[PDB]
Symmetry: D2
Subunit: 274 residues, 4 copies
């Protein structure tokens, strides 16, 4: 496979539906040696089996808000794996209230929480593991259109993702000198533990399905394969990029109508509402 | 005014609803000395009165597909005005068929026409008048979101506008050395002779009205004022820019819902649709 | 003038070279009634005379890190001015260390400071004064190309500005319903108290001067005029926009060479370098 | 392999250094069945042996300026291959003069040639072969940063590439309904027959090498692998995207300096310039 002999750290798995899992799964089918981290002991209940399923005995605790965990992590992968060829950063969080209502109502606390867990953790994760990164290593994080466009009540996470993509660009210049790559995979809406916690997500999901050029929502496998590519040597010439895996949704300047042209009607007015 | 003493050429007026007219109107209110061009004698019937209305006796014939017209134009403005401080390029065309159906169906002839009238003409207009341009001169052209985003059946005009905005960047580097500025005003949908010729434009218009942040379509005056700004010394520090005057529509990543949050419903499903 | 009768709050004046002063100066020349805020008593020494210079007796204390100041600000402008037509948000801070070295070295504390002072403050400032904002009101903030592109050691401030422009988009949708506008002016490098504190800024400045299409650095007046425009009714059709006032620098995909074409040489290898 | 059993048409091979060959090579290593086209009999001298090297006996003549060639192409692939899974569009042309001097000097003829051969050909190629495209088929074309940013004397080809990326977006919507994907690979500068014909290309090449984050130019293999990915089911969730394979160069907002920070000096002033 394209990751045969390669060692990578997967941060962000919560269950078999996690985007991090889709990527880990695809990276595994490519021969990668994987190691996983979990936020707490409850999540570990799902991460461990998943790890074993992917031939991995390396499971470490990691709550990006606890700096001491980063210390242990360094020592852990350095002892178990010795070095890393790729890092998957699939983590983000903001209080439930922040994701509803307007950005205006956001509290200073919710803001900092969103930024620290969703943005700064990439810096700390990368800086902490930099010594263990081999040449050609690849760092991947996840983003969403909400960083550069308005998306229904994405609010503060929108500011976080925009900062995150900027961080991807600066990190690429900081680590590129060492031949290390950094990119962001901008996935289209998909059902996950975090997404199921978002208001009217079924609607955001329905909207993408109908208005996206490929007229369908992206699968966990498609996001996973896209991540695996970004992480492999297949994309050794790619860095600082925000790669879209959203069935082409990002290209839409408005609602689709294309199929019907009698008087041209919104695909939305025809399907998933009437 | 901000254009007092300044001399500009207005290319693109077809009637009192033309964007070029809005711009000319706003520039006039700022003390600008104006000159106008018309495609043919039928359009001249509307351009002349408008020109007189704006205290202008300089009306020249100009069909961008006829190179000889550019020769006469140079001689005309050089004799009547001696020099130009700003140029407004508000012209575009493509066969009716091209704007309906898909891009795939576009013929080679419709493609070339769209590109020559909507893009090359800016090059030839600018190159032809370059010797008559004073320092600080400002060249302005019009574009639409369809250049960088998909908009319903905009098809070939989308490729043209994209090229046009790229031309704006190259022309800014070419003329910037001579202290001349070049920009593109990306207007939101608005009723005009050319727009009225487009299929289901009422819908594209309705859609922008409901989904745009300011919840309304832009007025001709707002587009005009924006243009005047771009043309005046007020923006002497701006060049190679694509300025959006679309009630903020360009920031939308999807349909609006913001106002209603019970279950959060698409503002489209509530207004202009039910 | 275009701001005659209009009332604006200027946040960010440190001295006669602050971008906020340029904007205030330009807005003043347009008949605007102004009110200013200062971070502390040392800054107030410069803010007051400036305020008087601009015919303003409304000077308030405002350190965006102290929530109680926002309460007093509300009560103050509400008592002195009654309502606001525009808000100028020209504030940003980050520890000196963050702006040097790599992003990777940034501490969690510096990160939060950068984000809170430079981004969250726009949210709190706007939310606090929302009730005093009249219809058609305009909120303006300042950004830099470092948000979407890598700029020498801009680091964390780059992430901040990316988030800021994203905030401008979400705030525009939140406030657009109330006919209020929100934009960001992306100014080119310019000598200010804050800029003078940045390493090798003379170089970033020199580089923009030689490589920018208009071959020069932007003047405080140009930035001020651009701001005034964004804040006036002249731009009532503009919102959620990131307006570039950088002598067109943003369009450069590489170093300039355009003038000399023998073998084509980098303008940088010819000027300010030999 | 990821293209095992998949059938694709490679358009644009001139020799063993052509980007189309790098992609064909990578697609071949993935089990794809290939078919090639050549402009004329002189090019065929290089295409055939290459085709045989890639286990391909399907070599067809195709000059995108001759419509009748598209007719023959349809009949040829339909008889030899029956159907297509992916199309590679790696073709562009502009008179030598256009690529030097300014855009302002471009003639109407050079403009049309640049647009027709570099942009319209994708439309015609795709429309002609649409009936032979299986579901999940992928259409790939090549672009360059010069489409959205100014690149030294890229001129009219910059307008063309901008239009080409816009076309990719519209074609993605037109063909997405049929589950077909359309993308654009934006390669970094690389030595090819066409590039060798461009003025001071060694400099543009040198400039990317030193200023790109990965501090190196991209290899033909890297571009090939990126293309193969875009053409394979690995990217089934990607469409209408402009994928950058330029060692991360696109993220640079100015010349690099990062490594040296004493006073921070442009890497350009240190290497390939002294
Ligand atoms: N070389 C680079 O650094 C670079 C960078 C970005 C994009 N590209 C793009 O890659 C594509 C081609 O790649 P390349 O650099 O390998 O060029 P190349 O010289 O290897 O071949 C591309 C050419 O297109 C073909 N062509 C020209 N006119 C044609 C016509 N009328 N009909 C059919 N074919 C025609 C030529 O035969 C030749 O194969 C172009 O779109 C080019 O703009 C190249
Ligand atoms: N689901 C989508 O449609 C979608 C779309 C775009 C982007 N994303 C991004 O993908 C990533 C999440 O993936 P997902 O959607 O599979 O959701 P998920 O729930 O599976 O993943 C979120 C992960 O973040 C972890 N996390 C939360 N707080 C943490 C903390 N303090 N320390 C360490 N880990 C913490 C959770 O434990 C969980 O494993 C996020 O970055 C998200 O923004 C998701
Ligand atoms: N109406 C909108 O919602 C909208 C939105 C975005 C951009 N635009 C742009 O604005 C410009 C047109 O403004 P408008 O909407 O007022 O349309 P309009 O009909 O009022 O103006 C179009 C002008 O172009 C002229 N023209 C066409 N072919 C010509 C030729 N061969 N030679 C000389 N002139 C020629 C017409 O005579 C007409 O005066 C176009 O470039 C268009 O793409 C319009
Ligand atoms: N100078 C440039 O070349 C340049 C370029 C692009 C953008 N900008 C932006 O312009 C804005 C400021 O303009 P400037 O460059 O003239 O800087 P400036 O020094 O004149 O203003 C910065 C202001 O921020 C204020 N500030 C800092 N911390 C504060 C706090 N906690 N509470 C309240 N106020 C606080 C300072 O008091 C000062 O008035 C910044 O947002 C900056 O990022 C500057
Ligand atoms: O970024 C996302 C974008 C989408 Cl469309 C769906 C889910 C996402 O992921 C998260 C992660 C944590 C929190 Cl609190 C909220 C959303
Ligand atoms: O560019 C435009 C965008 C919009 Cl929304 C509405 C009208 C426009 O202008 C034209 C000009 C000529 C032709 Cl043939 C078609 C459209
Ligand atoms: O954003 C900026 C961009 C440039 Cl080019 C120059 C100065 C800027 O403003 C600041 C404000 C506060 C800190 Cl701590 C650092 C920089
Ligand atoms: O697009 C390109 C970009 C670069 Cl950097 C180098 C070569 C390129 O390809 C071409 C193809 C045909 C002509 Cl006439 C000119 C350039």
């Amino acid at each position: 496979g394209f990751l045969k002999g390669k060692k990578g750290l997967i941060v962000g798995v919560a269950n078999n539906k996690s985007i991090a899992y889709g990527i880990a799964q695809s990276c595994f089918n490519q021969g990668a040696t994987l190691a996983f981290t979990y936020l707490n002991e409850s999540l570990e209940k799902r991460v461990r089996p998943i790890a074993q399923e992917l031939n991995s005995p390396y499971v470490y605790e990691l709550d990006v808000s606890k700096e001491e965990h980063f210390k242990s992590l360094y020592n852990s992968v350095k002892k178990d794996l010795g070095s890393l060829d790729f890092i998957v950063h699939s983590v983000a969080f903001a209080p439930k209230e922040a994701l509803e209502g307007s950005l205006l109502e956001t509290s200073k606390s919710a803001f900092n929480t969103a930024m620290e867990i969703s943005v700064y953790s990439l810096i700390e994760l990368t800086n902490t593991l930099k010594p263990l990164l081999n040449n050609g290593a690849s760092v991947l994080t996840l983003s969403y259109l909400g960083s550069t466009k308005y998306m229904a009540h994405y609010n503060v996470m929108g500011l976080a993702k925009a900062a995150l993509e900027s961080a991807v660009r600066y990190l690429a210049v900081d680590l590129g000198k060492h031949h290390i790559r950094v990119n962001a995979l901008s996935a289209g809406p998909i059902r996950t533990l975090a997404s199921s916690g978002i208001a009217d997500f079924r609607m955001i999901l329905k909207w993408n399905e109908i208005n996206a050029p490929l007229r369908k929502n992206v699968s966990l496998e498609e996001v996973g394969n896209a991540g695996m590519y970004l992480l492999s040597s297949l994309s050794s010439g790619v860095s600082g990029e925000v790669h879209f895996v959203d069935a082409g949704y990002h290209v839409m300047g408005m609602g689709a109508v294309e199929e019907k042209d009698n008087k041209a009607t919104l695909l939305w007015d025809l399907h998933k509402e009437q």
